[PDB]
Amino acid sequence: MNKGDITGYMDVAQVVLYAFWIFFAGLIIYLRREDRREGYPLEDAISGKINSLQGLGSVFSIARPKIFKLKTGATYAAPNFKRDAVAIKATRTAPTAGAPFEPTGNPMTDAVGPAAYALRDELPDLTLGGQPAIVPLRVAPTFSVAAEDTDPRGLPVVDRKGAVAGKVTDLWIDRASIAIRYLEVELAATPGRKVLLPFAATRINAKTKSKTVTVQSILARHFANVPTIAKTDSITRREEDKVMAYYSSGYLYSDRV
Amino acid sequence: SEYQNILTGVQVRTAPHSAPIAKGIFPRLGKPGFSYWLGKIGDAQIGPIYLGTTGVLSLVFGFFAIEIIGFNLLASVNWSPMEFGRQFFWLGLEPPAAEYGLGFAPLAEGGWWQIAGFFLTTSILLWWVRMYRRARALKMGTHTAWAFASAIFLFLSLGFIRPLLMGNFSESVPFGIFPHLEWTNSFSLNYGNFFYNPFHMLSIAFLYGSALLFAMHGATILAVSRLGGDREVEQITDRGTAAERAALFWRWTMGFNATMESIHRWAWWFAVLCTFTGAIGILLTGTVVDNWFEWGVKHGLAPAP
Amino acid sequence: ALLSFERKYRVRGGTLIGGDLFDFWVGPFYVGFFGVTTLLFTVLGTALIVWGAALGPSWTFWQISINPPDVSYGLAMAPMAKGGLWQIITFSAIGAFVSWALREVEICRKLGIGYHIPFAFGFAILAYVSLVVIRPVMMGAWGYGFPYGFMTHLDWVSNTGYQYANFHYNPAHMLGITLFFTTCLALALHGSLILSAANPGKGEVVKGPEHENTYFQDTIGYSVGTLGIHRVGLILALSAVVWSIICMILSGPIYTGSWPDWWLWWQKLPFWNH
Amino acid sequence: MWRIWQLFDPRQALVGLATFLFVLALLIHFILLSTERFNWLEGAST
Amino acid sequence: MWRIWQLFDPRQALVGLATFLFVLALLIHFILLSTERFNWLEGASTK
Amino acid sequence: MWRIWQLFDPRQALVGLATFLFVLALLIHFILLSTERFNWLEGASTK
Amino acid sequence: MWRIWQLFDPRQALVGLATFLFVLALLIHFILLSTERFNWLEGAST
Amino acid sequence: MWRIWQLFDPRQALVGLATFLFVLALLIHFILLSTERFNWLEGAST
Amino acid sequence: MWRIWQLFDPRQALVGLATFLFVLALLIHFILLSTERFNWLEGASTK
Amino acid sequence: WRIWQLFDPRQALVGLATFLFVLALLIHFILLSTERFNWLEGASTK
Amino acid sequence: ITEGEAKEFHKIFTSSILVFFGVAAFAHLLVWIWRPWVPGPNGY
Amino acid sequence: ITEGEAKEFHKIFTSSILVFFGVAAFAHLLVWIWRPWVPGPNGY
Amino acid sequence: ITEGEAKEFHKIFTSSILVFFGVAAFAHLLVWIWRPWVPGPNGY
Amino acid sequence: TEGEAKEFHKIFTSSILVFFGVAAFAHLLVWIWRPWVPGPNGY
Amino acid sequence: ITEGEAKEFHKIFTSSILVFFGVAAFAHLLVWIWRPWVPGPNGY
């Protein structure tokens, strides 16, 4: 029956469906442009020169830089076209572009693989009030652990093999998100040395009365090499990245190093 | 086992606070509370809520609609509380029959449904203005209101816009638990199996894709949560190793990746397109395609019967 | 080619099996041993699907359909032309999906991230395995599996639902639906909030966690926060799948009647069974 | 028995009691409206 | 038995007990209203 | 066996035990109401 | 020829090979059970 | 065999047993109620 | 043979074994109840 | 003698026990599906 | 709660529960007189 | 919990179970007199 | 787990499994006497 | 260590030989009951 | 894996594959005698 027809065979529902397919293809192009605001252009794996297999859609592939305005009055561009140095403290196992790298030295201190981090700003994340967000409870007297929970302070810090790394001496809290981000651990060896421990790299074990912070990521010997921070009461985004990357590398490297 | 970051073991407390907005006619209502179990999943603060003129309007219109429905349901069991509970899921308020067109039917013959539907519609559209204006008050983008507009477009298509195209309310949706399910069943059968409606197929693909994306994205951010990945807007404005490793996991897995910002555009568009393509599939049904299986046979979805 | 930050992460190690032999990349893709076995099962199963299309009556993509054996075969292996093809494709698909999950584990190991993604994908695999293995085994015939075809799997859904009079009345199916709708709602809200904070509008500075929490406190009186929403969004999607699996293990293996008639227990409760 | 007001806050007590009594009263009037004998608005005969 | 008030707070006990006994009583009256014999408001005969 | 109270908190134990025994009792009365023979409110004949 | 076992690790090879040979053997026995002539358990006449 | 209580926590043993044994007992009573011969409440003839 | 308890934890071994054996026992009793010959609750004749 | 120099003896036991149980369970269920070898139904060799 | 405070509450509780049971027992008696709820062999 | 306190609770608990089981046994006896629940060979 | 602990566990385990198999063996014997589970050529 | 693995081999080689022995006896009994290779006429 | 270990392995492996193929070849011969698997023009 003639109701929907546009031609002998063509009809409105079919036309509306192809109009959707045209829209959806255009949307995928838009979405893929947004996906390319970090990391692009692509580079040759060996030389690091800007190269990749590209069609004529290359001309629409990467968007003009959008500018984010930060409440400090600084800005961030995306794409910024900044890229990592071509040289790293590792070498390929075979000369082909697809080959993996082997670390030249200690990968955890050389910051390669899961020990690698981004060169974030040497600035702390800020509260809406402009104060640094992540600070020890020593400096945030209005914060407290909820009365229902175990306070980590004074607990021993223990690795997966049962060696004591130290004791918890402070909590670093995020004033903006209202959460514990790090524990500040005084080391058992070189007593008086303090290191940050990412709180999500821990759990509290309380099956036995002398409850303890267990750390699966790294062994007790690795705590002495945890990256240091420049200030005693604030931490930059770069220092956060450096510390968190170090512990994330433990699952691959801690039985090597 | 390492910490999987599914529940917050130790959670902190502080004085409740919130971002400033300009003074209105109504302050933020309620004393902020805290609950321990919400603090395990997420933030503990059962904070104050903003009212405002648009909030008053939406709740008043919506309350009247809910009362008109609820009173009609209880009247349909002759006010018995026992039969109300016994029959609750089966109770419904029905639209008018087709002979009334789009004019006001008698109250008992779907006039109450028309009033309830109008008041519910108005309340929802006022809630859209609320979702919009709360973003502008916070100097935030209006993305949430425009996502909500797609859900509303399906709701309006079901309840009013297709009736307007059909010239009567008889195939509009009844207010009732099993009744609106029965409407969904009968609508598919009357128009020749909704599986053959390609816009229902699209709507399903985006419904499945939404659960796919949230499973992928939720698992991704938790996988990088020991690297600070849950701090997404900070990662958007200063790319950390968490955003780098999230990108590389997907690139190495499937050959391509998003950014920390653009994955939220993929999320936004998939959920929007579920209801948008849904609404189009409803508006084409009976207006230009009377039997979707027969349309499918014409366009090669099935062999000729 | 590589992303501007990729090279420093492309280190050796993290493989579950096979050692160094497979530990390399083909363009953007990581290989590994489970990459190879992914390709093995993928090519086999795909070519067998195309073979089934060549055997069947049409090349119209929508109409192509590889069907399980007749229920009369029970759980025996059928002849290739009589449903055995569907059986080989099914177990090749299992091999492919399991290989894909284990390959993701190797990528997680290399990047030092948690295993949440392959774990979450394991619920997709379990849902597929429930429909093509567990349910038909408990029902005693491979012929209860869904056919591999663009429209014919939707026909199987239709036939299977109406076998129980009206599938909307399955209580686990109602809960599965609720969680799927809630997942799409939560995804719409989550995508919108991050974009509204990152894109406040021209002449406005990027907003942070306090604004993000304040928007949902102002609108709906609660905020789950930036970590909680990813926990919730994951749990919602996985729970929707779990209840979908339950709704199908109920329908046929356990409960065989009309789902509308199941609800009559409610009307018979003694405090209102007048 | 007056010591119950040392045990419980009168403000909470009266709000709870007023809510309870209203909902109970409304329930009973709805029950009666559903009967044949006691629906005063329909007024069936005895 | 007075030592049970060393085990339990009287404030909590009374609120819990009041809630329990009301719900129990409401359940029993609704059960009786579902019977032919004991629905006093409808008053079927004892044939 | 008084050493049970050195294993288990009597307060928690009594709350759990009372909750269990109520739910069990309530189940058994509802089971009997479902039978012909033991539904005392309907009172079928022992033919 | 033994240099192959320095190029391919015997731990990896024998696990992969045993897994491969089992799956292949299992496939072939199930194919034979699919047939009339070679289903030894049902044992139809020739 | 008392060493088993150094191996397993007695408090978990009792809570585990009580849970297991109740669920098992309740299962068996419901199984018997599903039979003509042993459903004592219906009391069919032998 | 006792060196197996150096290789495997006594605690997990007994728990895993008891779990395995109970599931296997339930499986066999339910299989027998599916048969006519061995369903002792139904008790069909050996015709 | 030497295969344990190539493979972890714990992994050998855990894998082999799981493999042998699943294989045994499969074969018993295969036999139950036959007429000739289902011992619990005990069809005649007609 | 002190020992004496417990003993004092127990006094008021004991009278209250006995009054509650006393009213309930009278209500059950009146209902039994109206229609008893234990059926004979012939039913009701 | 100290031994004397555990023994004090056990004394009252022991008394309570005896009352509870005593009342329940009396209830079951009356129900058995009304309608017994173990059927004979012909059933009920 | 020490050598002595392992050997002591092995002693208790060996006795327990032997008892468990002994009870099960008697259970199978009683079931076999009632209804054997190996059919003859003509079936059961 | 190799001697520690060598005494594992002693336990292995003995434990498989009883396992295969019990299985071989089970297969022999099943064959005596009902053989599982059909003749030309079938079973 | 040292050169003496690789030569040790190659000897054991080469014997093992020949034993595996030898058993398989005898199994195939037994099956062929029982029921051959190449049909004639008129089938089986």
Ligand SMILES: CCCCCCCCCCCCCC(=O)OC[C@H](COP(=O)(O)OCC(O)COP(=O)(O)OC[C@@H](COC(=O)CCCCCCCCCCCCC)OC(=O)CCCCCCCCCCCCC)OC(=O)CCCCCCCCCCCCC
């Ligand atoms: C053997 C088994 C094979 C199973 C089937 C597999 C299908 C997919 C093919 C997978 C293999 C592709 C390999 C490849 O392209 O490598 C390029 C790379 C050299 O490249 P390069 O130098 O590094 O430069 C590349 C770069 O410039 C390209 O730009 P960019 O980096 O921004 O993006 C990367 C691409 C990569 O894409 C892929 O690899 C495939 C993506 C997945 C396609 C899946 C299609 C089917 C699903 C439905 C589609 C739906 C489309 C709409 O990223 C993309 O293109 C991503 C596009 C994403 C669009 C998402 C849309 C979602 C919508 C969902 C549906 C909603 C419905 C309502 O190669 C080399 O280095 C040399 C060595 C390898 C040569 C490869 C030769 C060809 C292999 C073909 C394999 C056999 C295929 C049958």
Ligand code: 07D
């Ligand atoms: C339209 C202007 C211009 C034009 C010359 C051009 C033409 C073609 N492109 Mg393209 N494209 C252009 C621009 C551009 N392009 C892409 C991408 C991709 C990827 C994945 C996206 C996909 O799902 O596409 C969806 C469709 C979209 C985006 C529209 C262009 C493609 C069409 C109409 C071809 C569709 C027909 C097929 C038989 C299927 C092709 C294969 C797959 C999708 C796997 C995929 C392989 C692809 C295929 C092709 C083909 C076969 C052609 C032919 C026939 O000429 N294009 C995106 C990407 O990530 O690239 C790595 C992306 O960013 C981007 C940009 C900006």
Ligand code: 07D
């Ligand atoms: C026999 C049944 C038959 C069968 C063939 C089949 C089967 C399946 N289908 Mg379908 N369906 C059938 C019929 C049919 N199907 C749909 C729709 C869909 C979409 C909904 C998207 C959405 O988000 O909805 C949900 C969103 C809505 C409805 C819009 C947002 C809601 C709003 C604004 C309301 C706000 C609420 C308040 C303020 C509260 C007020 C209070 C009170 C009133 C008391 C979704 C993708 C989808 C999924 C599947 C699957 C997975 C299957 C499987 C596996 O079989 N189906 C709707 C539509 O869009 O159709 C194009 C629609 O109308 C319609 C019909 C009539």
Ligand code: 07D
């Ligand atoms: C007449 C039909 C009748 C009607 C009344 C009705 C209606 C509705 N229902 Mg329904 N339904 C009916 C029958 C019926 N219903 C379901 C199911 C559902 C679920 C589906 C999602 C899910 O399960 O995802 C389970 C997810 C799986 C199975 C995951 C599969 C994917 C995997 C492993 C990965 C695959 C990957 C590749 C192959 C790679 C390819 C290559 C490249 C991309 C390069 C969901 C909750 C649901 C929704 C609704 C709605 C919204 C409606 C509306 C609006 O009316 N229904 C199915 C299920 O539970 O399955 C476990 C099931 O089988 C079944 C039946 C037979």
Ligand SMILES: CC[C@H]1c2cc3[nH]c4c(c3C)C(=O)[C@H](C(=O)OC)c4c3nc(cc4[nH]c(cc(n2)[C@@H]1C)c(C(C)=O)c4C)[C@@H](C)[C@@H]3CCC(=O)OC/C=C(\C)CCC[C@H](C)CCC[C@H](C)CCCC(C)C
């Ligand atoms: C993109 C598609 C998905 C989507 C998106 C979506 N939904 C949304 C949004 C978005 C982006 C919102 O912004 C909005 C929201 O607020 O989310 C938190 C909303 C929303 N989605 C909703 C529901 C919903 N969404 C659904 C689905 C979907 N939503 C899709 C999957 C579904 C279903 C069936 O799948 C439902 C049911 C709501 C929770 C919410 C919109 C709320 C709204 O409009 O409320 C209007 C007001 C009322 C109903 C009245 C309430 C009255 C009270 C009882 C008053 C009591 C107090 C008062 C003071 C008394 C006064 C008495 C006097 C007058 C006498």
Ligand SMILES: CC[C@H]1c2cc3[nH]c4c(c3C)C(=O)[C@H](C(=O)OC)c4c3nc(cc4[nH]c(cc(n2)[C@@H]1C)c(C(C)=O)c4C)[C@@H](C)[C@@H]3CCC(=O)OC/C=C(\C)CCC[C@H](C)CCC[C@H](C)CCCC(C)C
């Ligand atoms: C469990 C929660 C949700 C979920 C999660 C999820 N899915 C995932 C992941 C996660 C977390 C991944 O990491 C993984 C991924 O890589 O995502 C990009 C994946 C994935 N989810 C996918 C799809 C998908 N997920 C779905 C659903 C869901 N996925 C759930 C809603 C659906 C539905 C409902 O329809 C689909 C189609 C893929 C994009 C991807 C897995 C890719 C993969 O396994 O690749 C290797 C295999 C191949 C390339 C092809 C193998 C081909 C086979 C040999 C034959 C298959 C034939 C088939 C049986 C029949 C087809 C006919 C149809 C018409 C029925």
Ligand SMILES: COC1=C(OC)C(=O)C(C/C=C(\C)CC/C=C(\C)CC/C=C(\C)CC/C=C(\C)CC/C=C(\C)CC/C=C(\C)CC/C=C(\C)CC/C=C(\C)CC/C=C(\C)CCC=C(C)C)=C(C)C1=O
């Ligand atoms: C924090 O925010 C996050 C981001 O980041 C910042 C993200 O990005 C994402 C990710 C999300 C998005 C980017 C959004 C878009 C995604 C979706 C909408 C989801 C749906 C996805 C798709 C539609 C894409 C589907 C594509 C898939 C599954 C990939 C298909 C590809 C293959 C099967 C090939 C795999 C390759 C392998 C195994 C190895 C390499 C091989 C080849 C390149 C080709 C074949 C091989 C050869 C040519 C040679 C080698 C072959 C061998 C050795 C074998 C030979 C033998 C044979 C038999 C073949 C998320 C979640 C996120 O939260």
Ligand SMILES: COC1=C(OC)C(=O)C(C/C=C(\C)CC/C=C(\C)CC/C=C(\C)CC/C=C(\C)CC/C=C(\C)CC/C=C(\C)CC/C=C(\C)CC/C=C(\C)CC/C=C(\C)CCC=C(C)C)=C(C)C1=O
């Ligand atoms: C960057 O990070 C971000 C955050 O932080 C900064 C965030 O915070 C959020 C925001 C997200 C959340 C706060 C939580 C999201 C969680 C979910 C979607 C899953 C669970 C569901 C909800 C929390 C409900 C969502 C809806 C809400 C809160 C209502 C919004 C509307 C109003 C307040 C006004 C109108 C509606 C009202 C008054 C009530 C609506 C009804 C319900 C909520 C359901 C009530 C239940 C029933 C009717 C019963 C149904 C069931 C029945 C009958 C049978 C079973 C019985 C039961 C009792 C269930 C996001 C997205 C985010 O990106």
Ligand SMILES: CCCCCCCC/C=C/CCCCCCCC(=O)O[C@H](COC(=O)CCCCCCCCCCCCCCC)COP(=O)(O)OC[C@@H](O)CO
């Ligand atoms: C001219 C004379 C010859 C001399 C030159 C010869 C040599 C050069 C040839 C190169 C072409 C082949 C490589 C193709 C990949 C090259 C890279 C690529 O993506 O190209 C696009 C086509 O991709 C692709 O089709 C990739 C396709 C991959 C998947 C193919 C599957 C085929 C099999 C299943 C089919 C049925 C499925 C079922 C259908 C229902 C086209 O560009 P386009 O700008 O958009 O790129 C996006 C980018 O530019 C954005 O930055």
Ligand SMILES: COC(C)(C)C/C=C/C(C)=C/C=C/C(C)=C/C=C/C(C)=C/C=C\C=C(C)\C=C\C=C(C)\C=C\C=C(C)\C=C\CC(C)(C)OC
């Ligand atoms: C007071 O105490 C309480 C709250 C307990 C009272 C009781 C309340 C209860 C129990 C309420 C129960 C409500 C239920 C069970 C509701 C179920 C609702 C469902 C499932 C609804 C599902 C879908 C409905 C849809 C999509 C309907 C849409 C209708 C629309 C959009 C209609 C619009 C109509 C218009 C605009 C009419 C225009 C015509 C005019 C009025 C202009 O001229 C006639």
Ligand SMILES: [Cl-]
């Ligand atoms: Cl956890």
Ligand SMILES: [Fe+3]
């Ligand atoms: Fe996010």
